[PDB]
Design a protein around this nucleic acid. Structure first.
Ligand SMILES: [K+]
Ligand SMILES: [K+]
Ligand SMILES: [K+]
Ligand SMILES: [K+]
Ligand SMILES: [K+]
Ligand SMILES: [K+]
Ligand SMILES: [K+]
Ligand SMILES: [K+]
Ligand SMILES: [K+]
Ligand SMILES: [K+]
Ligand SMILES: [K+]
Ligand SMILES: [K+]
Ligand SMILES: [K+]
Ligand SMILES: [K+]
Ligand SMILES: [K+]
Ligand SMILES: [K+]
Ligand SMILES: [K+]
Ligand SMILES: [K+]
Ligand SMILES: [K+]
Ligand SMILES: [K+]
Ligand SMILES: [Mg+2]
Ligand SMILES: [Mg+2]
Ligand SMILES: [Mg+2]
Ligand SMILES: [Mg+2]
Ligand SMILES: [Mg+2]
Ligand SMILES: [Mg+2]
Ligand SMILES: [Mg+2]
Ligand SMILES: [Mg+2]
Ligand SMILES: [Mg+2]
Ligand SMILES: [Mg+2]
Ligand SMILES: [Mg+2]
Ligand SMILES: [Mg+2]
Ligand SMILES: [Mg+2]
Ligand SMILES: [Mg+2]
Ligand SMILES: [Mg+2]
Ligand SMILES: [Mg+2]
Ligand SMILES: [Mg+2]
Ligand SMILES: [Mg+2]
Ligand SMILES: [Mg+2]
Ligand SMILES: [Mg+2]
Ligand SMILES: [Mg+2]
Ligand SMILES: [Mg+2]
Ligand SMILES: [Mg+2]
Ligand SMILES: [Mg+2]
Ligand SMILES: [Mg+2]
Ligand SMILES: [Mg+2]
Ligand SMILES: [Mg+2]
Ligand SMILES: [Mg+2]
Ligand SMILES: [Mg+2]
Ligand SMILES: [Mg+2]
Ligand SMILES: [Mg+2]
Ligand SMILES: [Mg+2]
Ligand SMILES: [Mg+2]
Ligand SMILES: [Mg+2]
Ligand SMILES: [Mg+2]
Ligand SMILES: [Mg+2]
Ligand SMILES: [Mg+2]
Ligand SMILES: [Mg+2]
Ligand SMILES: [Mg+2]
Ligand SMILES: [Mg+2]
Ligand SMILES: [Mg+2]
Ligand SMILES: [Mg+2]
Ligand SMILES: [Mg+2]
Ligand SMILES: [Mg+2]
Ligand SMILES: [Mg+2]
Ligand SMILES: [Mg+2]
Ligand SMILES: [Mg+2]
Ligand SMILES: [Mg+2]
Ligand SMILES: [Mg+2]
Ligand SMILES: [Mg+2]
Ligand SMILES: [Mg+2]
Ligand SMILES: [Mg+2]
Ligand SMILES: [Mg+2]
Ligand SMILES: [Mg+2]
Ligand SMILES: [Mg+2]
Ligand SMILES: [Mg+2]
Ligand SMILES: [Mg+2]
Ligand SMILES: [Mg+2]
Ligand SMILES: [Mg+2]
Ligand SMILES: [Mg+2]
Ligand SMILES: [Mg+2]
Ligand SMILES: [Mg+2]
Ligand SMILES: [Mg+2]
Ligand SMILES: [Mg+2]
Ligand SMILES: [Mg+2]
Ligand SMILES: [Mg+2]
Ligand SMILES: [Mg+2]
Ligand SMILES: [Mg+2]
Ligand SMILES: [Mg+2]
Ligand SMILES: [Mg+2]
Ligand SMILES: [Mg+2]
Ligand SMILES: [Mg+2]
Ligand SMILES: [Mg+2]
Ligand SMILES: [Mg+2]
Ligand SMILES: [Mg+2]
Ligand SMILES: [Mg+2]
Ligand SMILES: [Mg+2]
Ligand SMILES: [Mg+2]
Ligand SMILES: [Mg+2]
Ligand SMILES: [Mg+2]
Ligand SMILES: [Mg+2]
Ligand SMILES: [Mg+2]
Lengths: 114, 54, 123, 118, 207
RNA sequence: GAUGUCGGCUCAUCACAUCCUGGGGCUGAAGUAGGUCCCAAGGGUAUGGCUGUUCGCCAUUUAAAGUGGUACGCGAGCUGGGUUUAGAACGUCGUGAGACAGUUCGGUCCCUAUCUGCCGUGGGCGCUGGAGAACUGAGGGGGGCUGCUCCUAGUACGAGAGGACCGGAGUGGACGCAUCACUGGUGUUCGGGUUGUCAUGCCAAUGGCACUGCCCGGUAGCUAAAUGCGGAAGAGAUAAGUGCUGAAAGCAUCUAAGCACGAAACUUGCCCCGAGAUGAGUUCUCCCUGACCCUUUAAGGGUCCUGAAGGAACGUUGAAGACGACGACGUUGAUAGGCCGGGUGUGUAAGCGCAGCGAUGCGUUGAGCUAACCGGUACUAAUGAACCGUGAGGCUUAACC
RNA sequence: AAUUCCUUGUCGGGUAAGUUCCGACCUGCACGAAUGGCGUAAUGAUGGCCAGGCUGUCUCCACCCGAGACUCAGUGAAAUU
RNA sequence: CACAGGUGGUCAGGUAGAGAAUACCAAGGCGCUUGAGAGAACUCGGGUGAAGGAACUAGGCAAAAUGGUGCCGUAACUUC
RNA sequence: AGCGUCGAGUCGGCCUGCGCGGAAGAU
RNA sequence: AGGACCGAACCGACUAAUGUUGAAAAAUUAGCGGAUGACUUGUGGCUGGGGGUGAAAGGCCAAUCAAACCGGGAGAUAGCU
């Protein structure tokens, strides 16, 4: 309880930027091709955030080479090098699973001018 | 499914060896009214732990 | 998470458009194929003048699944559809010459190096 | 299994339970002492005590929340005008349950539940 | 020997190379030796230990006299560990989680969570019969429980419905992820038996 | 005066004439891979198409898809396709009623478990003064499957082609145990959207009902598809088999004396139960240190005084639970509820203001509300008592003091 | 073939695989012309077969809401023997 | 049997609706003559379900699904 | 057997007593 | 116009589950067919047992049908138990 909170607190990243569902984010992740280590960008719409301390996660959806892809990132993982908000989206819901049934014009999110 | 043989009065009694009631171990006595009551319950006259609760 | 009767899209230019898993290979009572596993398939739909025909029985490697893949940090990668790449029944090398859509790092092995190379993106 | 679960079903469905406790909460606020079954009394605390807590801060919003949960303006008025002020300095524990034997008709364990300053 | 601890809960350790290790956090306070058993007196070699604390009103006079002879404060229970021929301990000695400093794997014993009265589907992984196709009242029921006149009985050990869980379970060969002597913590990789708050016995892995 | 009969489903259990995996002899055994016979029952031992099918053929797997017994195991466990009631038709036979070891379409499967058995779970008494714990381990149960890749090594072997033993490492399938950190499901007890209608005087705001009205999300818990772990090594005694030394039988001979090796079988090792193990065991600790009477005088029966250790009961309860049971707590108190703070979820409440003819938008505002969560907190309820349990614990013999 | 025993006849189609189905062949065990023959649009809670959609039918079950089952109080059966 | 059965005629409010369907209500009438707890297996009646989608089975049995109005549009075959 | 050797038994039929293998099954 | 179409009342009874000492000696629940007709329904009437009636199932004729029910021949007869 207090023990686990203390164990979790000391592993948490301090520099996680504020983002919300509907934002376009670019996540840079470490890829390790044997000895070679490099960053790969994954850019897309945040459709879900799990706020849960060290166990926080967020789900990013993108259309990639004619295929819908979702990645669930573990927010405090060292695999995740950096997160940056590219565009702020205006949505009502916490969870944008309805976007899975939409493509192109129908899947557009209005910009949040705030 | 039903018995093939009539069970005895002996076996009836043996089954009922666990049916006996337990009397209340003891009654409590209200400090004020002196009324006997079931422990942690109010008295018949509406006392509990000395206080006229109802 | 592919089983017998599962229909897959085709992530190559072999000519097949829809294939059905008829066996999950590689063990007694093995239930499911995930990304990187080889399945037996039948071709249910194909383009005319392709490398393969409707009704052909051959192998495929699963390259995308809706169930997706877990990574060592606990992350998930999920796709919108199930897709495979057709393999020659004996040699287990790709029939096609191009790969369509993303694949995953799970394929990075000696057996599926041609798929990795041809893939437009490796997640 | 019911590990860590809260709330008694009381051999009713959810809509019946909600209506019953709304009625019983109104009865307790009105009369300040009621007799009910011991399990119902224990559940009633979880309904009535939050209403009293709500009634410590008199605002339009809170009166409407209380109205939504009681559906009785007489009860809302008594909560905000009488009980909230009466319990302003008390940190929870606005009710007490007094066990009082067994009901004649069905041997149900009974209890009085009353507001503590009645 | 091993030590007695408490299941605090589960979390994860992120490694530098981006592995998330699921861990059970075990609180291992000082285990205090309450009795040493030897071949002469007892017929076997073992230590009895206590850990934690107990309310003085809940410590009975027989319990209290046993702790008083050892010269230790009452803990929440007593547990024995058998000694190997090399090992030696004194009454009143404290044993900390530092015992596990160089131990790579441990066996963890606890009482599994209680499922109460469980059906054959849950308890024994029996297959359900048809949900439809005419099935009459026999969806999760066990099916046949024997043969016919030969043998004309049900065999002992027949898998049937009954109490499930709430029993001693050992999970073997769990990696020790961290020994934190300062905070009285052992982190082991993966799940161990029992609810949060339950007692665990941790021993160096037998295999 | 009824022993339900085919096939399937569910659940099995044994045999070994062994399908796989293990050990081995012979080979027309170079190697790889086979053949054949011996030992071996530990574990393991396909999914589909067609058909009522069992079977079979076929497709595609697998280390393998064993053979049999169990009322051709299993309908007071399920099914009811086949088959043998009554309806109807075809072919066929018959003058006909009708009929067929022909076909075809349709066509009611009851039982609340007394006893045995079995899975669980209590109560009683016992175990010799009583009590609280920790144990020992007689005995019992669980578990025991295996692929592929790499190294050894393109080495041994082979004219090439191909291609090992032995040993080592990695990673899977199936199965099992646990768990909920993660990924998810559920989440009628949380939040929101929304249709119809009724109500709260009306507006605004809310509530009821319509499957939770319909939906979208989702906390705790439970959970698998989630992720940890397991099968072993080692040891003993062996099977078939292989030997050493060695006579009977000057030789020879694994055997007669003596000695050695030898497998998933056996006994252990691992996990769980376990002293009703009446053969009722052990260790540690705690408690009780009054008086008196009668009498078939004996392990006799009262009386007054005493009431321990501890237990139970009652109450607040639990990640424990059908009930019992088991665990926590009872004011010298966090046991439950409430309350406070936080978290989580939902997604910017109401009211007011501003913009707009208006629907609505914007500000106040990531607002309001928020279950089972976390950290705290005596506000409420866990009572002073009472109850059960006693008062030094048999005889005999031995040893010691 | 609502008729064919041999028979899952044979050939073609459909399926990865089809004793059923559809199209043929004629070797009709044992069709056949008002106890009608062969066709036939429409119709059918009719028989057989295939496909799209759909799904807890199934892989393989999980959780939840209710009514019983369980406990307490009241009443109080039955077959069988 | 104070029994989820059977029994002909007449009357016909409101909102929504094509409607005497259906939902919610009015007038009016009722809560069905054992209750109280608990929140096991299993049974019954329901809700939701990852990935798959008939692999189930004698057989898609059951379930899931479709579902309104207006307009556009609609094949073989046909007794038109 | 050694019979290029040394020092008494040795060979293999027959009949018969008692044993041995042949000999795998399902709670 | 219609033994026309969709669909309540009304009339039926194709499937499934439940129930099977039932709530019920044939039902309940979810679906299902007909629904201006060879329709359906109230009241009354007529047909009588080798007889009736039957869009024909040996169906129905008072929970009874390959010959109703009640009384009688009657203590039929029973080489059977
Ligand atoms: K068998
Ligand atoms: K061999
Ligand atoms: K075996
Ligand atoms: K059967
Ligand atoms: K039987
Ligand atoms: K049954
Ligand atoms: K018996
Ligand atoms: K979880
Ligand atoms: K959850
Ligand atoms: K409303
Ligand atoms: K004992
Ligand atoms: K128990
Ligand atoms: K509290
Ligand atoms: K706002
Ligand atoms: K506002
Ligand atoms: K919030
Ligand atoms: K014929
Ligand atoms: K004729
Ligand atoms: K004609
Ligand atoms: K007659
Ligand atoms: Mg009894
Ligand atoms: Mg709780
Ligand atoms: Mg009830
Ligand atoms: Mg409702
Ligand atoms: Mg439990
Ligand atoms: Mg099954
Ligand atoms: Mg039935
Ligand atoms: Mg059923
Ligand atoms: Mg017997
Ligand atoms: Mg008989
Ligand atoms: Mg053998
Ligand atoms: Mg065996
Ligand atoms: Mg054996
Ligand atoms: Mg063994
Ligand atoms: Mg088969
Ligand atoms: Mg049989
Ligand atoms: Mg058999
Ligand atoms: Mg039977
Ligand atoms: Mg049949
Ligand atoms: Mg007939
Ligand atoms: Mg039955
Ligand atoms: Mg054993
Ligand atoms: Mg065993
Ligand atoms: Mg598994
Ligand atoms: Mg959690
Ligand atoms: Mg979720
Ligand atoms: Mg929901
Ligand atoms: Mg809601
Ligand atoms: Mg009004
Ligand atoms: Mg309004
Ligand atoms: Mg209403
Ligand atoms: Mg209503
Ligand atoms: Mg061994
Ligand atoms: Mg010799
Ligand atoms: Mg093995
Ligand atoms: Mg006290
Ligand atoms: Mg939030
Ligand atoms: Mg609102
Ligand atoms: Mg803002
Ligand atoms: Mg709060
Ligand atoms: Mg707390
Ligand atoms: Mg035939
Ligand atoms: Mg044929
Ligand atoms: Mg053919
Ligand atoms: Mg098919
Ligand atoms: Mg078929
Ligand atoms: Mg034909
Ligand atoms: Mg004819
Ligand atoms: Mg003819
Ligand atoms: Mg003629
Ligand atoms: Mg003629
Ligand atoms: Mg005709
Ligand atoms: Mg014709
Ligand atoms: Mg009773
Ligand atoms: Mg009644
Ligand atoms: Mg009635
Ligand atoms: Mg009527
Ligand atoms: Mg109306
Ligand atoms: Mg109506
Ligand atoms: Mg229930
Ligand atoms: Mg159900
Ligand atoms: Mg549903
Ligand atoms: Mg699903
Ligand atoms: Mg969902
Ligand atoms: Mg889905
Ligand atoms: Mg589909
Ligand atoms: Mg299909
Ligand atoms: Mg099938
Ligand atoms: Mg099948
Ligand atoms: Mg259907
Ligand atoms: Mg439906
Ligand atoms: Mg012999
Ligand atoms: Mg008509
Ligand atoms: Mg009729
Ligand atoms: Mg109906
Ligand atoms: Mg019609
Ligand atoms: Mg109609
Ligand atoms: Mg007839
Ligand atoms: Mg009749
Ligand atoms: Mg006659
Ligand atoms: Mg006569
Ligand atoms: Mg007579």
């Amino acid at each position: 309880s207090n023990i686990i909170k203390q164990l979790e607190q000391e592993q948490m990243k301090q520099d996680v930027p504020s983002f919300r569902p509907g934002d376009t984010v670019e996540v840079k992740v470490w890829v390790v091709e044997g000895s070679k280590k490099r960053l790969q960008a994954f850019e897309g719409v945040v459709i879900a955030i799990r706020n849960r301390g060290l166990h926080s996660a967020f789900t990013v959806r993108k259309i990639s080479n004619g295929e819908g892809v979702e990645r669930v990132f573990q927010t405090h993982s060292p695999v995740v090098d950096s997160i940056s908000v590219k565009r702020r989206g205006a949505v009502r819901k916490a969870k944008l699973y309805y976007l899975r049934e939409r493509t192109g014009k129908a899947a557009r999110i209005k910009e949040r001018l705030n | 499914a039903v018995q093939q043989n009539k069970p005895t009065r002996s076996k009836r009694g043996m089954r009922r060896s666990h049916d006996a009631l337990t009397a209340v171990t003891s009654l409590s006595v209200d400090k004020t009214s002196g009324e006997k009551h079931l422990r942690h319950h109010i008295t018949a006259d509406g006392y509990y732990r000395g206080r006229k609760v109802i | 998470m592919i089983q017998e009767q599962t229909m897959l899209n085709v992530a190559d230019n072999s000519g097949a458009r829809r294939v059905m898993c008829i066996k999950v290979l590689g063990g007694s009572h093995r239930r499911y194929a995930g990304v990187g596993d080889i399945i037996k398939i039948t071709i249910k739909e194909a383009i005319p003048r392709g490398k393969v025909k409707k009704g052909d029985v051959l192998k495929a490697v699963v390259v995308r699944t809706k169930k997706g893949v877990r990574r060592p940090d606990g992350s998930v990668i999920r796709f919108d559809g199930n897709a495979c790449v057709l393999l020659n029944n004996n040699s287990e090398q790709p029939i096609g010459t191009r790969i369509f859509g993303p694949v995953t790092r799970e394929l990075r092995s000696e057996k599926f190096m041609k798929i990795i190379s041809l893939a437009p993106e490796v997640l | 299994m019911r590990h860590r679960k809260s709330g008694r079903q009381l051999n009713r469905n959810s809509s019946h339970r909600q209506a019953m406790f709304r009625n019983m909460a109104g009865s307790l606020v009105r009369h300040e002492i009621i007799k009910t079954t011991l399990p119902k009394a224990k559940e009633l605390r979880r309904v009535v005590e939050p209403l009293i807590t709500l009634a410590k801060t008199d605002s339009v919003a809170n009166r409407r929340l209380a109205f939504a949960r009681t559906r009785d303006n007489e009860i809302v008025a008594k909560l905000f005008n009488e009980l909230g002020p009466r319990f302003a300095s008390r940190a929870g524990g606005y009710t007490r349950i007094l066990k009082c034997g067994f009901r004649a008709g069905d041997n149900a364990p009974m209890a009085y539940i009353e507001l503590v300053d009645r | 020997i091993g030590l007695v601890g408490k299941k605090v809960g589960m979390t994860r350790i992120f490694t530098e190379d981006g592995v998330s290790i699921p861990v059970t956090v075990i609180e291992v306070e000082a285990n205090r030796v309450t009795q040493v058993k030897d071949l002469a007196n007892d017929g076997y070699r073992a230590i009895q230990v206590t850990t934690g604390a107990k309310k003085a009103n809940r410590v009975t006079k027989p319990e209290a006299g046993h702790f008083a002879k050892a010269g230790v404060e009452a803990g929440r229970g007593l547990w024995e560990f058998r000694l190997a021929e090399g090992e030696e301990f004194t009454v009143g000695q404290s044993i900390s989680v530092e015992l596990f400093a160089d131990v790579k794997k441990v066996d963890v014993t606890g009482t599994s969570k209680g499922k109460g009265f469980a059906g054959t589907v849950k308890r024994w992984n029996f297959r359900t019969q048809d949900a439809t196709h005419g099935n009459s009242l026999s969806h999760r029921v066990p099916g046949s429980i024997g043969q016919n006149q030969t043998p004309g009985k049900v065999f002992k050990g027949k898998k049937m419905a009954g109490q499930m869980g709430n029993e001693r379970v050992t999970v073997q060969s769990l990696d020790v992820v961290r020994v934190d002597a300062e905070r009285n913590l052992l982190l082991v990789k993966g799940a161990v038996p029992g609810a949060t708050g339950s007692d665990l016995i941790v021993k160096p892995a037998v295999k």
